[PDB]
Design a protein around this nucleic acid. Sequence first.
RNA 1: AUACAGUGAAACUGCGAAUCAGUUAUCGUUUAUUUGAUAGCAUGGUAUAACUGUGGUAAUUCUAGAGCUAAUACAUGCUAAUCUCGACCCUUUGGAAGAGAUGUAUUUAUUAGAGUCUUCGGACUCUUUGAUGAUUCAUAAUAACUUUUCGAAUCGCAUGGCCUUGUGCUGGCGAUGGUUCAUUCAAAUUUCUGCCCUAUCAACUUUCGAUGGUAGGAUAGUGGCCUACCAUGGUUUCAACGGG
Lengths: 383, 250, 137, 42, 140
Amino acid sequence: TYPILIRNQALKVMLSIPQVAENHFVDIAPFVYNDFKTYKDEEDMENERVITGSWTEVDRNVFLKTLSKFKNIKNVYSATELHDHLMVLLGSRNTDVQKLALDALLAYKNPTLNKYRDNLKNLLDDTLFKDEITTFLTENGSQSIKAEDEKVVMPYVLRIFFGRAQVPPTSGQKRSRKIAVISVLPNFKKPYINDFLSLASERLDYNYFFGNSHQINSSKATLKTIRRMTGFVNIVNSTLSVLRTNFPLHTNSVLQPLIYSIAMAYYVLDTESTEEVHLRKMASNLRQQGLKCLSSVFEFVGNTFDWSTSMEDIYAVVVKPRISHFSDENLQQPSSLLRLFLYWAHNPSLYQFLYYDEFATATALMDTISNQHVKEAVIGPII
Amino acid sequence: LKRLAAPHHWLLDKLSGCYAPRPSAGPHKLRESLPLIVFLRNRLKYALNGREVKAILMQRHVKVDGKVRTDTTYPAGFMDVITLDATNENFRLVYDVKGRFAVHRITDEEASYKLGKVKKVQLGKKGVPYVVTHDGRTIRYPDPNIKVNDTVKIDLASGKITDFIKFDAGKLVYVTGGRNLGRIGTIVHKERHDGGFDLVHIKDSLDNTFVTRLNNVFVIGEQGKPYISLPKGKGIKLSIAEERDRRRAQ
Amino acid sequence: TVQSERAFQKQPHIFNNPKVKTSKRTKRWYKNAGLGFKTPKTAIEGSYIDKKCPFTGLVSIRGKILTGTVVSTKMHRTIVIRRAYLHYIPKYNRYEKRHKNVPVHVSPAFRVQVGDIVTVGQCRPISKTVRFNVVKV
Amino acid sequence: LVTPQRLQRKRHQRALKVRNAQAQREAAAEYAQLLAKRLSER
Amino acid sequence: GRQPANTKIGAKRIHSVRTRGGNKKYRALRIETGNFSWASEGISKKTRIAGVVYHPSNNELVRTNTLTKAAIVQIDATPFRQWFEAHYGQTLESSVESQFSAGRLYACISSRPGQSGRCDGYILEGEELAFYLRRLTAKK
RNA sequence: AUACAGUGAAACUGCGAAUCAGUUAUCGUUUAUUUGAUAGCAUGGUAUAACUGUGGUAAUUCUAGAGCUAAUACAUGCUAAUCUCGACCCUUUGGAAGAGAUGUAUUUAUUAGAGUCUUCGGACUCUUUGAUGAUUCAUAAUAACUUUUCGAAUCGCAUGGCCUUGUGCUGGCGAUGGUUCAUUCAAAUUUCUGCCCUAUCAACUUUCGAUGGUAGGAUAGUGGCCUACCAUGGUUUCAACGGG
């Protein structure tokens, strides 16, 4: 078959055995087959085929995944080999981004020369996915911190488009719509962690606007729910358990960062789903953050206490009782100062709020602080 | 690439051919270290010429302070030990009365440590402390009470330290250099200038003081406890005339 | 003064914090390159820059510390001193009048007087011909 | 050619790296013990 | 000595130079981008060089705009703009603030391109700002 | 010894190819080599040598042509994994649900680098760091830039063990390489004195650099080694300057 793929890539008679061409482009095979097949599809023309739209779609998905260099270059050659109208003004940007000399400012500058045409968006998203597929050890780091920061010079619609593009392979809304998810794949579970890292990178690069896309946010919630599902579905050989602990810590710290960075024009009226997911994360052990470096649990609770809007979805569950319990542990760590500041912020933002549930939460907080704030012996900072 | 202006404490004659062994690069300086060739050929005469010196080095036979080091021109100099399994011997090689290198004959439990004056101490990298002593033993992790011009007892089997030795009044010192070379004793007074020319001053039975620069001298030990058996019965070199006077007396 | 040139004069990398308020705008950098001296008040509360000076500039002093009498000050930041030392000759078996020229980069720490005795030491070579630096008049 | 010896040497390089690290970062702790002793002393 | 370099703006192209005793020096020619740094709170970013306005020893370089050390600049302002309005929540010193809608900033080069081959700017802020605006007034 | 196993020509690769004199400093440079520390893919492709051939050419260690095939030659490329806090238990010298932390090379900006109380035995809290004479020293943290450095696609002798006999997982001695620091060996400059005779040599150097200061370039670097800009210096009857 490798000799057959090489012979059909040498003899370039396309549209003669093109019956299962798009089916082979939608089917799976090895990498030695995939490189020769993408070379053959770039050697063809793809103007009139069985389905030229399906060929361009498989080219876009290959330039998305691509293993970050080789199929990215081959699919860029295929996309130029297709009907590449309004792309000869960006062929330099495409060749630079597919090449290993991808100066990111140069790629976003040649696209800023090819701008006001918007015919480079799918190629730029596939180049962003290729630059995001860098893996492990400090060269991947020096490339990823360049890529996620340099992609901020793009459209305000195309940023949410790239976020939804990351959302697509591991959204699973049809899996999580009924109750929760029930199927466990570690390879897609790692892509959830990659989406978590890319979303945290985009939030840290632009933490004012942050660009909320609702299906991407619900897919991040679905990834955290799959993490709690694996924790309840413990695989005690535990490579999956270590991967799930690596996914849930970064997932919680990323989901706290999006809310705590945007905090004004995001986190829409469907906050009850995130409150339900946080209730699922607290129903294991609500007081499991008694350390001073309590990451994202105390941050989400304190951000909900700080922003006065979130008290409704706070008092939906009994979550202020959980934060008061983690504060009212006996040997509590130096996060007790953040808990007392949370009591200060939640007094005039729940006891000066709506009486049905926010003043009820403030009454529960005052009843906690009357008989549980006794040991005030903070002999450290007088401030 | 040549020699014959060799340091004259090597017991080297003039009619041994022209060139002398050039000391290769190693632990010590050239002016105060003898190579294994001038040791094994014309210092204890276990060999005759360089061909058979190469034979008894590449016989896996010599072990300068714990390891083989097959190199003729290897500058194993001051305070090292040279063990040989055959001939039962360990040679701590030190200074003496006249200035040249006195051999010892050392047993095993004294031959399983040397000691070293520190040359400098710093902090190396990643927070780790940093000690280098006179032979290039750049050793990590000392005890924290580190001074400079200070003696550490190197375990010499595994290259760590086993004992620490400070320096102040009333603990022994031994000179390596100057006109007063190879001499012990430490009891007068501890004077220090700035810009050098200072010494821990040296005792005598007649209170004879020898003051040099402090780079040459370093601690052996304390009163009653030196950490090395000493050459030729604790050589202080009183006088040839006093030696003949003691000969006429006893 | 603050300038004599097209470029700018500034202590490199010893900068202030340009956001918060301090009443200096440049922390004038203290140093002493050795020799047991106490730091001069003109360096603690001075105004010049002088990259060849041993009290704010980054040059170091050690080695040959010598003395002599100032005779020439007409140059730019560099003065010539007179090591008026007597020599000996094997012919006459007497003493003779001898001196050589030694130039030294003067520092604006204390004033530049024609006639005083200086104590200057060997520095890393500041120029083509001058090798020492003024550490104290 | 992949031999029984080549992956043996690869395994030995792995073992040497992990043994050097698993001596070094423990010798750090046995230095920190003496530092803690002197900190309790002073 | 050896030959002059006189590196320019645009189209990065660097000679590979080995010199006396190892010490691989990067003889960069024709620098295109530059890493600059906020001098009062510490954020650095690669930033696209436009031009060189000032030379402190020879107005031949004010003519030909040759990149060297100690040459005052006006560069890009856009990645600092994107960080300035994308992480703040403010989306805005006062004379530094005056250089926002002008599309140009001001800084200085310290790393030698004929020696190190780098491209460094520090955003001048304070008496540096005062002296360099007085130098703009000295030119104009 | 059906991959190889002995010797092994050839060839590639690796390594090596006025003397000035005494005289200090290199906190102004690099430091090949030795030595000592030191760094958590059952392993891919070139592009060729020797050789086989076709010749020219009086001829050279002259060569072109094609067929070949090697790497410690050239050029790409990888595996969770460990240290903190550990509520609780069951007593710990633990094992624990998990709140966490993650190399190096270059460049810049910083920042840190400064008198009671007594089981008379004991405690009751007292200060952060390595120094020289001396630092923008040594070192640690963030931010990115790297025409992207390294973190072993290597070799010889044995090849032993664990038993779930896989064809697994392990494991010894040492040969080369390689990051950084130190050492050792060096270089290249630098402080102070000197030598041939002379006033029928008294003025010599800012000619087309003379001498400084400021920036820049060159530098392995201190440094007119040079560039421009600011200043008009500096040497000398002391035997200078010039000449023998």
